[PDB]
Every structure is written in C-alpha cells, then in structure tokens.
C-alpha cells in the first residue's frame, strides 16, 4: 500500500519562499523508474501540473513556473521537496504530490511501459494561502430587501478562514445559503450568507457569525429597513 | 504548449445513466493519457491509465478508449458517487497537462433563479466602502451570467462571485455576486443594476435600485 502526505506552512506572505514536503511510504525513490510529481489546484479551478522527479534523479518543471521551482529528493528519508520562490496571491491553491509508477519489469527487465501513463496514488493535498494579512475579525453588515423575500449578512474583511454563520442561533436552516468566501485583492476574505422566506414571515432574523481565529462573535438582527 | 480540451465542460445526469466524457489533444499523445474522478474535498482518483487500462480496484462500469488526439471515458451505469468532476491528463509531452475538467451533476428540471439586489448598508458606507450584492437563488443548470451596470456603464474588474455546491434536496445552485466601490464612487451614481442571464429565463432579468432614493 502506497500512501503520500504533503506538509508545509498553511499561510505564506507574498515574495516569500514556500517549501512543501511530500513524505511517502510503500515505495522507495530508489525503485526502478519511479516518479513523484506535484500538482496544484487553486480554489474552484482545474488541476495544474508543476513538476516531477524520478528515482534516477531526472527533474522536469512546468515551463510557466520553471524559474520559481526547485524539486529535490531525499531518498533515505522517503521525501520529495518542492521549493517555490517569490510567491504571490495567485499561488494560493491546494498542493498535491503523487506517485508515478515506473515500467513493469520481468526478472529485472522492463517489459511494459503502459503503467507509467498516469499518476496512480495521490496525497490528500495541503491548502496554502498566500496573503500579507494579519489575523483580523469580520465587519458584519445587513443585507435587506415564488413570492419569496431574501435577506442576509455580508461578512466582510476577515482573515484567515474559516468563519461560521448560522441563523437564529441554529433554528433557522431551511432556505439558508452560506456562500464560500472569496479572497479579495486586499488579502482578506469576504462572504455572504442569505436566507429566503415566505414574503409574509417578515418572525425575526438574526445571523450568528463567529470567526474563531480573531475571537470575534457577532449576532446581527436583520430586518426590512424603513424604520 | 499542448492543449487538452474536455467536453462537455459540465454535464447533467441521473443515477443509472450512461455518460461519456471526451478529451481532445492539440497534437497526438499516443496512448499516454489518464482519467481521474475527483469528488469534492478529496484528491483526484485514478480510473483509467494508458488510455484504456482499468486501474486496479476501480469498478468495471468505467471504461476508457481512444489514442492519438481523441479519447473518451464512459461510465456505463452512473452511481451516486460518480457525481463529481472528471479530468483527463496527457503524459506524452512535458509539461504533463490536465484538461479543464467536466463537472457531472444531478439532473433536474430547468429552474430560473429568483434574483435580488441589495444596496450597501449605511453602516458600511460610514466606513468608506460600498458593497452591492446580487443574489441568484435556487436555479438550474449551473451556468449563469451576472452583469453589473451603474448608470448604464458596464462594470468590469470590480466584482466577485461564488456559487454554492448543488443542493442535496433541490438539485439547484445559488450564486452571490458582490460589486465593490469606494463610498465616493458609489455616491457619484444613481442606478445600480444586476443583469442576469440564464437558461430558464426567456430573456435577461434586471434587478435594480436608485441610490439614495427614500
């Protein structure tokens, strides 16, 4: 059984250097033709290939990132390290390392190369956020209005993830939509949480927001304005 | 470099259907192509290697064929765990490219979004910033287009949006879009509009308000 696992800092600041380690078990980077590669996935985006290293020590890099990447192996520790320099916000992504089989051998003779055509086992992935932000609590603002009515709370400018939002201390669940946060160009996150109700219920509505990282709890009652 | 284009980018289906996803390469990649299935929150999982070989432990309903520039993955009888995003990967040329992915989600009847526009709170305005949010609630299919207009000027580069995951009961999606402006710019205009295009809407729907109108 082959397993891989990524480790490194969850948070990194722009211009800094990011070092990611892939520790694995079940194979050796001294085994014939084996490879270990790195692939990343920005939130909501497609997979992007970064680099790979083989047991005979040949290395290859994405041409778009070549100047900022270094991949290396430590055979005796069963680890592969990928160093990315000068990171910027667009480098925020989940980073995965993965195993690549070498050709099948028969009495130590390569006879099948078909198994090298895939990365067959992947690590769970490690989430890395690139922001120059210091920890900071959200500002919470009201969002106020088939014949459904909508209202919500805009949880703005906080760092880092995550934040939790519930409605009426947990009693309001139907019609609730809490969207995934977006990382603003400022380096702070922002999210909305809304709830749809029969245009008659306008019943009271209060969003309970909690950002553990900054010890910031806020309850904000939201109503249909006009005094 | 080499381009790998998946089709369709998104696909709706129901348990028991037969689906086929295709991947086309800009130059021939021989048989060096792999297919993966990735469920939300998890790493991609290898299904098919070398264009058509079934990976060990992978269920037989998955099948891959093709070589050169055109490949296909077919799942013969879709199971609930197959609602996910699929990717193809080329390993003939460096860099070892991935396709854009194809999202497979639960099919349901077309439903237009209920649209709502929210002006910025007076509380936010006092801090100097103005957020205008637009909500597209419970729609299907997933693709939707939101266009912000301020006093009829088309907005660009100053909004961000996020979409919920498919609802497990509804099978619909919801989308939130935030237009952000300084309090100053905000004050220099009156009509804030959120224009929405979607398959379930005969023509685009616009929700708007005039700033400061009381």
């Amino acid at each position: 059984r082959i397993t891989l696992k990524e480790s490194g800092p969850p948070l990194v600041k722009p211009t800094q250097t990011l070092t990611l380690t892939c520790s694995f078990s079940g194979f050796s980077l001294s085994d014939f033709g084996v490879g270990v590669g790195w692939i990343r996935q920005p939130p909501g985006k497609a997979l992007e290939w970064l680099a790979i290293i083989y047991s005979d020590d040949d290395k290859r890099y994405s041409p778009s990132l070549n100047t900022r990447l270094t991949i290396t192996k430590d055979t005796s520790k069963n680890q592969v390290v990928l160093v990315m320099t000068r990171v910027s916000p667009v480098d925020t992504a989940t980073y995965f390392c993965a195993h690549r089989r070498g050709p099948t051998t028969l009495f130590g003779v390569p006879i099948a190369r078909g198994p090298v055509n895939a990365m067959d086992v992947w690590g769970q992935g490690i989430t890395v956020t690139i922001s120059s932000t210091s920890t900071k609590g959200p500002s919470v603002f009201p969002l106020a209005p088939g014949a459904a009515a909508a209202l919500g709370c805009l949880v703005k400018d906080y760092f880092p993830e995550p934040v939790t939002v519930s409605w009426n201390s947990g009693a309001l669940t139907s019609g609730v939509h809490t969207f995934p946060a977006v990382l603003q160009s400022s380096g702070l996150y922002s999210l909305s949480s809304v709830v749809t109700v029969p245009s008659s219920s306008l019943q009271t509505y209060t969003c309970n927001v909690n950002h553990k990282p900054s010890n910031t709890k806020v309850d904000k009652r939201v109503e249909p304005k006009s005094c | 470099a080499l381009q790998l284009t998946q089709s369709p980018s998104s696909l709706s289906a129901s348990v028991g259907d037969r689906i086929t996803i295709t991947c086309r390469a800009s130059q021939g990649v021989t048989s060096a192509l792999a297919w993966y299935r990735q469920k939300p929150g998890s790493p991609p999982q290898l299904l098919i290697y070398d264009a058509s070989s079934l990976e060990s432990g992978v269920p037989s309903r998955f099948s891959g064929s093709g070589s050169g520039t055109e490949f296909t993955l077919t799942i013969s009888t879709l199971r609930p765990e197959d609602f996910a995003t699929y990717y193809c990967q080329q390993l003939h040329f460096y860099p070892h490219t991935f396709g854009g992915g194809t999202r497979v989600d639960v099919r349901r009847t077309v439903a237009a979004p209920s649209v709502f526009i929210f002006p910025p709170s007076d509380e936010q305005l006092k801090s100097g910033t103005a957020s205008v949010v637009c909500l597209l609630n419970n729609f299907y299919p997933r693709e939707a287009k939101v266009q912000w207009k301020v006093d009829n000027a088309l907005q660009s580069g100053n909004s961000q949006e996020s979409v919920t995951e498919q609802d497990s009961k509804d099978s619909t999606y919801s989308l939130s879009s935030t237009l952000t402006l300084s309090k100053a710019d905000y004050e220099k205009h009156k009509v804030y509009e959120c224009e929405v295009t979607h398959q379930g809407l005969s023509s685009p729907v616009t929700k708007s308000f005039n700033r400061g109108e009381c």
């Binding site: 490879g35 040949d58 090298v116 | 390993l91 003939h92 040329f93 460096y94 070892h96």
Partner: peptide, 7 residues
C-alpha cells in the same frame, strides 16, 4: 520535449 517514457 518528449516524456521520459516516449518513443
């Protein structure tokens, strides 16, 4: 360029 196992 071509992959490690190409040709």
């Amino acid at each position: 360029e071509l992959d490690k196992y190409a040709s």
